[PDB]
From a paper:
[name] was successfully crystallized in an open (no ligand) and closed conformation with an endogenous ligand in the binding cavity. As a comparison, the distance between Asp 222 and Val 435, residues that respectively reside near to the termini of lobes I and II, are 35 Å apart in SapAclosed and over 40 Å apart in SapAopen. A transition from the open to closed state requires a 15.6° rotation around the axis bisecting domains I and II. Conformational shifts such as these are characteristic of the SBP superfamily upon binding/release of their cognate ligand and have been described as a “Venus flytrap” mechanism. In SapAclosed, the lobes enclose a cavity with two narrow openings to the protein surface. Difference electron density (Fo—Fc) became apparent within this cavity during the later stages of refinement. This additional density was not observed in SapAopen. Identical RNA binding was observed at the same site in both SapAclosed and SapAopen and therefore did not appear to affect the overall conformation of the protein. The antisense strand is provided by a [name] symmetry mate. Furthermore, although definitive electron density is only present for a 19 bp stretch RNA, inspection of the symmetry neighbors indicates that the RNA strands extend across asymmetric units, forming a matrix within the crystal.
Important for NTHi survival, colonization and persistence in vivo is the Sap (sensitivity to antimicrobial peptides) ABC transporter system. An essential system for NTHi survival and persistence in vivo is the Sap (sensitivity to antimicrobial peptides) transporter. This multi-component system uses a periplasmic protein ([name]) to bind and deliver substrates to the heterodimeric inner membrane-associated Sap permease (SapBC). The Sap ABC transporter is completed by two membrane-associated nucleotide-binding proteins (SapD & SapF) that hydrolyze ATP to provide energy for substrate transport across the bacterial inner membrane. The structure confirmed the classification of [name] into the Substrate Binding Protein (SBP) superfamily, as was predicted from sequence analysis.
Numbering used by the authors: 35 to 133, 163 to 560
Amino acid sequence: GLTYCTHASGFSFNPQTADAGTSMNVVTEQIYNKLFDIKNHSATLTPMLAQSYSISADGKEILLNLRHGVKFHQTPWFTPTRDFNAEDVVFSINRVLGHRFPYFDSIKLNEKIKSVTALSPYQVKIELFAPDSSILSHLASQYAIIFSQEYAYQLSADDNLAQLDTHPVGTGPYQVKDYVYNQYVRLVRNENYWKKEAKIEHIIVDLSTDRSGRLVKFFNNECQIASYPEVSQIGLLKNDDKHYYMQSTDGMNLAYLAFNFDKPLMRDHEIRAAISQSLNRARIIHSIYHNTATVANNIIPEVSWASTVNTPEFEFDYHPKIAKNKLADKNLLLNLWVINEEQVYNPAPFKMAEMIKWDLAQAGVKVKVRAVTRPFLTAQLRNQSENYDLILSGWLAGNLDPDGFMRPILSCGTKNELTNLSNWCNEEFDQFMDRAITTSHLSSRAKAYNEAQELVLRELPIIPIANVKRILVANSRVKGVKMTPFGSLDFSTLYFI
RNA sequence: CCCCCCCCCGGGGGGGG
RNA sequence: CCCCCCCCCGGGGGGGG
Ligand SMILES: [Ca+2]
């Protein structure tokens, strides 16, 4: 057995309905498979539930050839009577097309895909409205998990369709044995997996502790891997210890401040720029993240294939004297909302808020900080009653296609209320993004994404603060631990020496 | 039941990073 | 880590008894 300690914050057996950009979803990446995985900087598609695919010459039709012989989990709540096939893919993709899903609604997946049909039991046809170079990447994201149509059918007969997300059935290398809300998930190896079996038979995912206590549990041998350690407690760790080791990874893990474009005073570009210039972001990174983050003058991370070498100068970096000149006379009062949760991209949200409140005080701007819960925030956004000026947030992604993160955060939409906290709509921005998916040439796409990014850093609908590393500590008895920019920890490769 | 062919997985070996 | 080639095994599919 191995115990893996992580945060309970926004844990779910279903990321399609969870909040976008908050989690690598370590548990559901073990129990469900996708049609493809992307594992590398180059954006190679690894065949998973699809063995292969073709694209039509006009680029509007994709054929998925599904792997034969794949089994869904035999659990106490479900006995499958057929193998995975096209019906499962059609059910799964059709559900999110709507033929509330925050990620898919934020990318507007139903304005990309026209239909999804089974040509045969082992071949699916996707047709698009127009050529779209992003589609296969979205189907390789953590959100695009394939469910069991047979299970969903059985449950619909007796009304219990909610149980799809409470008692999971997947094709992945682990299955759910049992769990206790906010305490633990017990995983057991799938003995009928379609690829190399997981080496460790039993895995407990411990959710029951805050950052402080996770290293306590680790050194008291209550868990053998521990995610997202406290940052002051990394100072207590060494690299050359025989008994444990650390790993850390870059990726798409961004803390940022969004301006509410619904507030008339936030529309003034002079105000946003001066507010950006009031912030001592270097002080913030040093003081909150220590060494686990760098100041972010870019939306697109350097590990992304879309990243343009030459990180320029940010025109609105710390300059407290210019900020004070522009702001002091306006007698500004800003409401700053902070989400009261553990966040992969911000270890001390309130402490960061207070530092922002301080920096803006020096520029003569009064800030009232307001702690808020995810449920409260979610309700207000769904209800369009949100009345913040600033909100402190972030984005986490294992998918480094900018269509999968820049679009949810900043694109026009009516059904992107959970992800676009700026309430920002810019036609010029949206044209860059739409151009970026009309070609399959990486450099061509990158150019379009860099033009979009450059526009964002001029307009300042958000202020980027920090690119945050993901860290874990592992017990030296454990091998096969690979932390990567490109997804969650794969439990199936863990083993004991 | 058997025999071709295709495909996928796993394992072993050899060659090249 | 990976990628070819070979062998063995397992599974699926197609064709022929
Ligand atoms: Ca809104």
